[PDB]
Design a protein around this nucleic acid. Structure first.
Ligand SMILES: CCN1C[C@H](C)n2c(c(O)c3c(=O)n(Cc4ccc(F)c(Cl)c4)nc(C(=O)NC)c32)C1=O
Ligand SMILES: CCN1C[C@H](C)n2c(c(O)c3c(=O)n(Cc4ccc(F)c(Cl)c4)nc(C(=O)NC)c32)C1=O
Ligand SMILES: [Mg+2]
Ligand SMILES: [Mg+2]
Ligand SMILES: [Mg+2]
Ligand SMILES: [Mg+2]
Ligand SMILES: [Mg+2]
Ligand SMILES: [Mg+2]
Ligand SMILES: [N+]
Ligand SMILES: [N+]
Ligand SMILES: [Zn+2]
Ligand SMILES: [Zn+2]
Lengths: 180, 368, 368, 180
DNA sequence: TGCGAAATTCCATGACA
DNA sequence: ATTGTCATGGAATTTCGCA
DNA sequence: TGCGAAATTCCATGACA
DNA sequence: ATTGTCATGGAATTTCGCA
């Protein structure tokens, strides 16, 4: 069995609805399996159309051999199937209702929630820095960040301040005022 | 003046006037019998005015000016007086063309890493497509890897929006560009400083300085053209296709695609290279670091036989950038303050500002 | 196809496939173990389609196309199949640049007499001056002697009015010009025929062909510029001054002014040459006939190392004259009917018209 | 004494009034003394202004050392004197009321009169051919035409048909109908 | 029959839309 | 069934003034 | 240890407003 | 106080297949 590589498998998934930001509500999340590198895309809906529009941008930089997702409607549509077939991408689905990627996805949700407090509406603009944070974050398992593994070099934005990622008592009470 | 010419008439010797010729008075003027015929020797005090008259007929250079003068006059060292005048004719100096070539180009070292330096530029305006007219082209210096963004204008704000999308992936140390309004605005500088990015500018009107991106523009337009043959010029939907197409094209001198130089492995694109299938990613990245350091680097070419190279304190003239019809192509003479390298200089422009300037937009002022 | 590849698998020898390599089946495909790794050998019937896929990714030339293919495949003589395809890609052929230079220029003989040939052209539009915008420039081929006429438009009628004033002095055998609308109109042809004048046209968009007048345009603009420095661009009143000034200027290689070549004696202008004061007019005209025949004539320069020269029956492509944005710079291939000289040809353009054309507006079609 | 040359002396004079042609009424006549070459200029009046405007065209091709004329007002004005002085031209006047040039001037008047019959109004357009005729006309005294003497070559318009220059019985009666 | 310096010739460079 | 040209000013080469 | 032909490298040409 | 570049396709040179 040949070793795991970048572009072997992209894991995609939607996050949202979120509070409106520049008219956007969701985030398409793409994580490369091998490097753990994350790309994020703001969408107005978790539809096949929004997915294609978003992945079209990504696939003009790099094309995965395999896309993996859950059985979200956007991903199981025949339009999405046709789109993938045109690009020679194999689609892969986890069975309904049930490592490195799973952890990364957790970090994203948690990192997002920590920043949409006091400014639940300014996240559109924050996406670039979210990604840079995520991709220049040290991996405990491998000795390297996703940046390092994708490009084979150090980054010019090392995030040496490994941030709390937890909610302070200020934010815990400010988040329970948000729902109210 | 009349003193020198007196001694001359009464047979005495004066330095410069060969003694072996017969000098005489006639019509109240000192003459001499030269092999080409009889010429008047005007007094020294008359000479400057004569040269000026000759030169001004058509603002002729050395020989054509001399040939007019020699028709009527002789005196010692005529051309020295001609040259003296040419060097003082503002109209000739700012209008004539140079007849000296620049020294040979520099071939600066390839940036060492991806993301060390971006070269950026706009192409356009192009035919309208979905309401877009321009393309922002961003070229990574080390890899040649390129990003394309359609815009409605070559503006700071469209540049800022595009670069925010790009810099989501990685932040570069330096972004290098020409002095287009989009890149020199203070709004863009704040955007750069905010992110630790140093802005570097080419000397004005010298697109060779950032030749990497300029050359990529050519390939972009070339591929767009081929794809649009026999169809209407709807290029907007083609940008992504062109980006991907070019990033995965081999440079025959390099034997690599920009994508390969960026990632060290092909993605799922047609004819993906399979050579490192059995290496681990770590082994692959190790071979990559090695490939990156051993890329062909061109060398500085031989100088042309009549090149000039700048010297501190030399008088030089900047090329007028957008000369109006019937106006001079050259600015007034200025002075080389510093020679940054044999192809770039700082000049003081008579106003007098400091300007950093390409040798290709300079000529050395003639006749000192 | 599958036949050839069958023999190959069972150890038999086929021409082109080196016997010293191990050929096998795997995943239902014929493979081979080459020093660079294992490649698929597609059947002959598959190959054209593969090359096409490779080429079309970015419409790459020989090596870049080959490098894609070699990633997955090997078969005998790959580049021959690559080249075959490049030669059939209409988009590549009409869009790519030439990489061959024209053969060295011709230096045609100077017309033998004043009035044998006029070269004419328009300069403009210039800034408005007294309501005039253009200059008709008429250059006598033998003498360089030049006539200037201000016009409101580069039209036949303004050309006709000006040439009527000029031809009051003398009628030329030939008038040579580019294919501007003013000179190709039937009205102008009738005007020429009426007076025994033969019209000769340069090949289209090749101003070098009538380089004498083009070069004189430069001097005219240069002198106008110098004279207008620091004033508003009121050039109309300067035309006569420039005419006179230039006609009485020495060519340093010739040692004569165009006026001298025309008349054999200076008129009453500053620094008039007095050398023939003692000759009779008849003796003067005799020396003139002699001076006219012994003028320096330049020779054809050495060819560049990668020049091409036209051959009857060769496929060549005319340069598109005014290519729109994102459109090819070259016309579809055409055929050389006749080689008029090594720098000029007649082609049949696929429509198919005869067109006489400069080699400088041609490239040889690549890959035969 | 050095031999006679082109541009040594231009002889000028006015002819007219003539019948209007394109609003022009006079002809300024310029004959080079040595070659006998003729230049003609249509004017609206025999004034110093019209003379300067005309000679400005000629003197942008060739400048005479001396201009000779009769004491016509246009030539004796101080404006004309100033004009000549600026160009380094010496002015020369024949005494009031009293060779090659004189003959040429006769030919011009006679040639003009022969052509302004049946078309007394179309002479403006005929000036070019008048000049070419005059300048490619053989000189009995010298062996050469003015063209040949000015340029040192044969012309591409030789006028081998040395025309009558006389009035036919048709033109004699058609000229006495013109005055009537 | 040879020196130093002036004169002349040579010629690459660039611009004619 | 047509075609480069030539001012320019440093450099290279030749000629001049003198001996 | 040397041949003919294929493969590879070399590199002038031209175009990025 | 900065800096040309690189696809292209014939030609030149090197390597390959074989002996
Ligand atoms: C307004 C700021 N600005 C300044 C000038 C206008 N400029 C800008 C450009 O992007 C380009 C450009 O791409 N090219 C094409 C070209 C020509 C020759 C070459 F060698 C290369 Cl490497 C490229 N030319 C110019 C120019 O200077 N024309 C005279 C140019 C620019 O943005
Ligand atoms: C419409 C008919 N027509 C055709 C073209 C437009 N054309 C006409 C001209 O007079 C010129 C002209 O002077 N130059 C300047 C130039 C450029 C390079 C040179 F080597 C030389 Cl000797 C002269 N260029 C062009 C031209 O072809 N530009 C692309 C030109 C003309 O009248
Ligand atoms: Mg989901
Ligand atoms: Mg630009
Ligand atoms: Mg550019
Ligand atoms: Mg023209
Ligand atoms: Mg022209
Ligand atoms: Mg009179
Ligand atoms: N460098
Ligand atoms: N010829
Ligand atoms: Zn001047
Ligand atoms: Zn193609």
């Amino acid at each position: 069995d040949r070793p795991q590589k970048p572009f072997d498998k992209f894991f995609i998934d939607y996050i949202g609805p979120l509070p409106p930001s520049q008219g956007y509500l969701y985030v398409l999340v793409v994580v490369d399996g091998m490097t753990g590198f994350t790309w994020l895309y703001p969408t107005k809906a978790p539809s096949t159309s929004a997915t294609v529009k978003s992945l079209n941008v990504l696939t003009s930089i790099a094309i995965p051999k395999v896309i993996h997702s859950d059985q979200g409607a956007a991903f199981t549509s025949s339009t999405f199937a046709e789109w993938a077939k045109e690009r020679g991408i194999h689609l892969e689905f986890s069975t309904p209702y049930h490592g490195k990627v799973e952890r990364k996805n957790s970090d994203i949700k948690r990192l997002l929630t920590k920043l949409l407090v006091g400014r639940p509406t300014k996240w559109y603009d924050l996406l670039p820095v979210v990604q840079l944070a995520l991709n220049n974050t040290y991996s405990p398992v491998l000795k390297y960040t996703p940046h390092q593994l994708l490009f084979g070099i150090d980054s010019n934005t090392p995030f040496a301040n490994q941030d709390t990622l937890d909610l302070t008592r200020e934010e815990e009470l400010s988040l329970l005022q948000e729902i109210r | 003046l009349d003193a020198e010419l007196d001694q001359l008439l009464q047979g005495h010797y004066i330095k410069g006037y060969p003694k072996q010729y017969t000098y005489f008075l006639e019509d109240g003027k000192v003459k001499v019998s030269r092999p080409e015929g009889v010429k008047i020797i005007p007094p020294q005090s008359d000479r400057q005015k004569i040269v000026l008259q000759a030169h001004n007929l058509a603002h002729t250079g050395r020989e054509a000016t001399l040939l007019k003068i020699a028709n009527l006059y002789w005196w010692p060292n005529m051309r020295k007086d001609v040259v003296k005048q040419l060097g003082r004719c503002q109209q000739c100096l700012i209008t004539n063309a140079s007849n000296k070539a620049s020294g040979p180009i520099l071939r600066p070292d390839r940036p060492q890493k991806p993301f060390d330096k971006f070269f950026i530029d706009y192409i356009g305006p192009l035919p309208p497509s979905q309401g877009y007219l321009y393309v922002l082209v961003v070229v990574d210096g080390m890899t040649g890897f390129t990003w394309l963004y359609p815009t409605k204008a070559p503006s700071t704000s469209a540049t800022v929006k595009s670069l925010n999308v790009l810099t989501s992936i990685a932040i570069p140390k330096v972004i290098h560009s020409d002095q287009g309004a989009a890149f020199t605005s203070s709004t863009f500088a704040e955007w750069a400083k905010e992110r630790g990015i140093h802005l570097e500018f080419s000397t004005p009107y010298h697109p060779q300085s950032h030749g990497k991106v300029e050359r990529k523009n050519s390939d972009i337009k070339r591929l767009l053209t081929k794809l649009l043959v026999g169809r209407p010029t709807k290029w907007y939907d083609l940008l992504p296709v062109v980006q991907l197409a070019l990033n995965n094209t081999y440079s025959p001198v390099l034997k690599y695609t920009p994508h390969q130089l960026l990632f060290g492995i092909d993605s799922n694109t047609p004819f993906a290279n399979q050579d490192t299938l059995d290496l681990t990613r770590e082994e692959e990245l190790s071979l990559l670091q090695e490939i990156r350091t051993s890329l062909y680097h061109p060398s500085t070419p031989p100088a042309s036989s009549r090149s000039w190279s700048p010297v501190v304190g030399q008088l030089v003239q900047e090329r007028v950038a957008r000369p109006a019809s019937l106006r001079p192509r050259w600015h007034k003479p200025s002075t080389v303050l510093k020679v940054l390298n044999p192809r770039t200089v700082v000049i003081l422009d008579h106003l007098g500002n400091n300007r950093t300037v390409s040798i290709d937009n300079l000529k050395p002022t003639s006749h000192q």
